[PDB]
Design an enzyme around this catalytic site. Structure first.
Site, PDB file in Angstrom:
ATOM      1  N   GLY A 169       0.609  -1.102   0.290  1.00 23.76           N
ATOM      2  CA  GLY A 169       0.241   0.200  -0.062  1.00 23.76           C
ATOM      3  C   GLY A 169       1.016   1.100   0.038  1.00 23.76           C
ATOM      4  N   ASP A 192       1.070  -1.977  -4.200  1.00 24.39           N
ATOM      5  CA  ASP A 192      -0.625  -1.672  -4.189  1.00 24.39           C
ATOM      6  C   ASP A 192      -1.400  -3.028  -4.271  1.00 24.39           C
ATOM      7  OD1 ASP A 192       0.607   0.848  -3.544  1.00 24.39           O
ATOM      8  OD2 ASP A 192      -1.871   1.463  -4.572  1.00 24.39           O
ATOM      9  N   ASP A 202      -8.315 -12.768  -0.885  1.00 24.53           N
ATOM     10  CA  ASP A 202      -8.097 -13.226  -2.226  1.00 24.53           C
ATOM     11  C   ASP A 202      -7.073 -11.764  -2.641  1.00 24.53           C
ATOM     12  OD1 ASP A 202     -10.961 -14.679  -3.028  1.00 24.53           O
ATOM     13  OD2 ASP A 202      -9.694 -15.573  -2.461  1.00 24.53           O
ATOM     14  N   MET A 203      -8.106 -11.129  -1.790  1.00 25.49           N
ATOM     15  CA  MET A 203      -6.909  -9.550  -2.194  1.00 25.49           C
ATOM     16  C   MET A 203      -5.438  -9.322  -1.857  1.00 25.49           C
ATOM     17  SD  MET A 203      -8.089  -5.311  -1.359  1.00 25.49           S
ATOM     18  CE  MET A 203      -9.880  -5.511  -1.515  1.00 25.49           C
ATOM     19  N   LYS A 216       1.480  -0.084   6.846  1.00 27.98           N
ATOM     20  CA  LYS A 216       2.114   1.589   7.651  1.00 27.98           C
ATOM     21  C   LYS A 216       0.785   1.556   7.392  1.00 27.98           C
ATOM     22  CE  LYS A 216       4.016   4.644   5.503  1.00 27.98           C
ATOM     23  NZ  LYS A 216       2.782   4.722   4.948  1.00 27.98           N
ATOM     24  N   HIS A 220      -5.818  -0.884  10.534  1.00 27.73           N
ATOM     25  CA  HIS A 220      -6.400  -0.701  10.919  1.00 27.73           C
ATOM     26  C   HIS A 220      -7.973  -0.283  10.605  1.00 27.73           C
ATOM     27  CE1 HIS A 220      -5.760   4.001  10.115  1.00 27.73           C
ATOM     28  NE2 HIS A 220      -5.636   3.691   9.287  1.00 27.73           N
TER      29      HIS A 220
END
Lengths: 314, 314
Positions: A169, A192, A202-203, A216, A220
C-alpha cells in the site's frame, strides 16, 4: 468548588479552541510574524493579512484568545503592544517537516467535522460520514514522511538481518525509499493491492515474496477476521527462518500517561465515524497475532502517533 | 519533547470533547445510571437506551472515551465491568438547578456552532451567524435563575438601603421575584424596553423611578456609546443621595486564574460572532462608568460566570 463545573464548561467549549486555531492558520499569523523576523503591533499585523479592510477590534480579540491559548505572545515593548510566537507556534510555521498546517486545515474543516455531530445515530445499528454529508493527501503524504523518518532514526534495527522488503500500500513508493536510502542492501518493493473501484484473502493472496512485509496504517481499516487472513497471506510470503511482518499502527492504552494518549483515543473514534475501522489495544494486537498462527510479537514506541509491531510468524 | 506538539493536537481535536459530551447527553447516560441507583454493565446500559437495536462495540468505545474524560467511571466488580458516574457527571443529572443539560444541548448544537467556522470572514469588515446559516430560552431562564440565587445568597447586601428596585429587561419578572421574596420591603418593578420588531437613548428615556436600577446581561449587547447613554438615563431615574445602578455581567480578566477565565474569554468571542457585543475588562467598565459621569463603582465576584458591578452615579 467551581473546578468540576469548569471542567464541564471547558469540555462544552472545546470546539472553540479547534476553530480559533483554524482561524489562526487561515490568517497565516504564524508565518507573517515569522517572516517579519520580530514581534508585530496589531496594526502592523493587520496590514499584512490576506484580507482587505480589517476589523481591528475583532483581530485584537482573536489575538487575545490566541495569547491565552499560549500559542502567541503579547509583550509591552517601547510602550507598544507587540505580538510574537510562543514555542508551540513553531508547528504553525511552514517550511519544515513537522509543520502542522495541513493537518489543522483538514481536521478542522467543517465537512470533515460534520460526522462527529452524528455520533449518536452511529450507535443505533452506516458510517456517520454518509449521514452527515450524503487534496489533503498532503496531510497523509506528510504523515507517512514523519513515520518513515522515525523508523529509520529511532528503531532502524527492525530492518536488520533482511535483504528484501515489500511495502504493502505504499503507492508510488515515497515512503519505502527512506528504507531504500538508509539501507541500500535492502531490495525494496512497493506493492499496491488490487481493489474494486465501485474479500481481503483474495486481495492479498499474491503478495511478493520478501524477507519482510511492512504494513503502515493498513490493518486499522480491517476487522479482526480480515486482519487474520491478511496476516496469514503475509506469513506465506516470508521465509521460515528470518522472516517477519512489520505493522505500523496505533497501540491504544487508555491507562498511559503518554502525551498522545488522548489524541489516539480520539482517532479511534474518528475511525469509527468515518471508516468503520478501529485502533487496537496491545492485548487486541496480541490476540490477533496469536490467532493468525504467529509465534510472537514485539511493540516498539517511536516519537509518532503510531507504534511499531514486529510480528514473527515462525 | 512531544508536549508542545501534543498541546497542538489537543487544540485540534478539542471539538471531539464537545461532541462526545453532546452524545452522552443525547443518550441520557447520566440519568440512566443515576436512576438505576448503582453502576451498570454495558449490556444493561444498552438495553435502556432510547435507541432500538444498539451497536454495543460503538457504545463501548464511546463509554471508554467518556471514562477517559473522567465524566464516567469504569470498575471491575464481581469480575464484571460496570459504568458509573464521576463527580462532574452530577451536572448531567436532571432535576436540580445546576443541571447543565440545556446549556450543553444549546451550545453544541450544530447550527449554533456554525458561526465559529466563519470567524475569519468575521475579521474582514456582518455577524458570522448570517454567513453561517443565511426553545433554549430554558438555558437562559435557568441561567438567570442561578444568577438571582447567587445575588441573594452571596452578596445580598447590594440590595441594602433601598425600598424600590426596577429590573430592566426581566420580561415576566421571574428573575426579580427572588429579590421580592428575600427582601419583601423592596417594591420590585420589572420593565421591558420598547423595541422595534423589524436608538438606545430614546429606548431608555422613560425608565421608572426607583432607588436602584438592575441590568442583568443587558449592557454586554451594546457598544460603549449606547451604554453611556443607557447609564445616563439610569442616573436620571435614581435618587441623588442613595441611588445606584446594579449591572450583572462578565468582568473579563485574562490574567486571572479563576476556573471560569477561559469560558469567559470564549463567551466574548461568541458575542463577537453572534450579536456584535463584547465582554468588558474591569478597566473598560471603569472608563465606561466614569465616562457616563458616574462617581464610582465596585466589582463583586459571585459563584457565577457574571460578576456584579455596583455603579454609583452621585
Amino acid at each position: 468548588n467551581l473546578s468540576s463545573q469548569a471542567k464541564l464548561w471547558n469540555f462544552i467549549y472545546g470546539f472553540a479552541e479547534s476553530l480559533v486555531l483554524k482561524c489562526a492558520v487561515q490568517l497565516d499569523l504564524a508565518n507573517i510574524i515569522h517572516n517579519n523576523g520580530t514581534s508585530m503591533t496589531l496594526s502592523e499585523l493587520s496590514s499584512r493579512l490576506p484580507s482587505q479592510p480589517v476589523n481591528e477590534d475583532a483581530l485584537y480579540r482573536v489575538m487575545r484568545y490566541l495569547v491565552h491559548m499560549k500559542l502567541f505572545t503579547k509583550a509591552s515593548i517601547d510602550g507598544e503592544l507587540r505580538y510574537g510566537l510562543a514555542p508551540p507556534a513553531k508547528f504553525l510555521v511552514k517550511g519544515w517537516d513537522k509543520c502542522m498546517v495541513g493537518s489543522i486545515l483538514a481536521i478542522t474543516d467543517k465537512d470533515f467535522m460534520a460526522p462527529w455531530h452524528y455520533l449518536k445515530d452511529g450507535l443505533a445499528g452506516g458510517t456517520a460520514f454518509e449521514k452527515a454529508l450524503g487534496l489533503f493527501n498532503e496531510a497523509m503524504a506528510n504523515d507517512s514522511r514523519l513515520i518513515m523518518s522515525a523508523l529509520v532514526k529511532e528503531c532502524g534495527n527492525i530492518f536488520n538481518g533482511i535483504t528484501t522488503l515489500v511495502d504493502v500500500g505504499g503507492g508510488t513508493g515515497t515512503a519505502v525509499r527512506n528504507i531504500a536510502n538508509a539501507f541500500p542492501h535492502i531490495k525494496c518493493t512497493v506493492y499496491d493491492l488490487p481493489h474494486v473501484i465501485a474479500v481481503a484473502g483474495d486481495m492479498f493472496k499474491f503478495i511478493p515474496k520478501a524477507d519482510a512485509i511492512m504494513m503502515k496504517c493498513i490493518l486499522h481499516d480491517w476487522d479482526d477476521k480480515e486482519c487474520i487472513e491478511i496476516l496469514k497471506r503475509c506469513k506465506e510470503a516470508v521465509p521460515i527462518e528470518g522472516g517477519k511482518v512489520i505493522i505500523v499502527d496505533i497501540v491504544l492504552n487508555v491507562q498511559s500517561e503518554h502525551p498522545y494518549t488522548k489524541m489516539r483515543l480520539t482517532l479511534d473514534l474518528d475511525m469509527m465515524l468515518n471508516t468503520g475501522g478501529k485502533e487496537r489495544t496491545e492485548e487486541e494486537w496480541k490476540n490477533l497475532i496469536h490467532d493468525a498462527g504467529y509465534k510472537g510479537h514485539k511493540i516498539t514506541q517511536i516519537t509518532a502517533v503510531q507504534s511499531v509491531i514486529e510480528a514473527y510468524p515462525y
